[PDB]
């Protein structure tokens, strides 16, 4: 992410790291046995067996005391995902339980994030945190080592769709966040990242409202990041999360 700072160790219990082959993505623990990510991460359809999920991580690919590694038993890409439009850009990872019937072993560093209310109307005023291990500036050489997070305001669809922003590229199921001025944004290597936004009606006041999907260039002017709108997909998530 660009324009952010290193996140506190206890700051991101929900975030999950996903490793396979030469690839990496992030995601969010939304229940003890379930991770929500971006479908475009798994576009190439790797085998669950090759997927490794690590919860409770702070440094990308760094072993740590709170860290927990897990296999993936299966995963589902949204049936209407398009690798061209990136509409419907979400996927569910079913974690493999151990012999005790547990998947994620919760602790202060490993906890699920609350799902979005959905019914409540979205507002420009709402503020959100975006997080990830991707590029800290455009043209960056490597991925970050420590998790970065940055604060970004939500952006209404009517203003993100407007022709000076992203125009016709913004479809149902997407959402935008960030400064039209630029400067603060998710970037390449931040795919599958959780956008967590203030929710005044929620008991925790904080819910998962976006999945890092796409944009145009790390933090450029007049170009907010585009996220999957998690509230749009509650029914799909409930339905394929009984599973």
């Amino acid at each position: 992410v660009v324009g952010g700072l290193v996140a506190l160790r206890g700051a991101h219990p929900y975030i999950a790291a996903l490793y396979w082959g030469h690839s990496f993505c992030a995601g969010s623990l939304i229940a003890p046995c379930w991770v929500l990510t971006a479908a475009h991460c798994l576009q190439d359809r790797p085998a669950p067996e090759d997927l490794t999920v690590v919860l409770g991580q702070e440094r990308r690919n760094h072993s740590c005391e709170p860290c927990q590694t897990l296999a993936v038993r299966s995963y589902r890409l949204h049936e209407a995902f398009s690798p061209v439009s990136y509409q419907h850009d979400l996927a569910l990872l079913r974690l493999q339980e151990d012999a005790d019937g547990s998947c994620a072993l919760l602790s202060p560093y490993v906890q699920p994030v609350c799902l979005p209310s959905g019914a409540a109307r979205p507002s420009e005023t709402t503020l959100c945190q975006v997080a990830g291990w991707g590029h800290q500036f455009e043209g960056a050489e490597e991925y970050a080592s420590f998790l970065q997070e940055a604060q970004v305001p939500f952006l209404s669809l009517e203003r993100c769709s407007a022709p000076d922003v992203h125009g016709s590229s913004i479809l149902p199921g997407m959402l935008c966040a960030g400064f039209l001025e630029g400067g603060t944004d998710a970037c390449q290597g931040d795919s599958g990242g959780p956008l967590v936004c203030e929710d005044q009606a929620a008991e925790r006041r904080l819910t998962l409202q976006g999945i890092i999907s796409w944009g145009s260039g790390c933090g450029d002017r007049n170009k907010p990041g585009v996220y999957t709108d998690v509230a749009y997909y509650l029914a799909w998530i409930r339905e394929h999360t009984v599973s």
Partner: peptide, 9 residues
């Protein structure tokens, strides 16, 4: 203390 609820307050 138990979980903190994820519900609309």
């Amino acid at each position: 203390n138990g979980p903190l609820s994820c519900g609309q307050r």
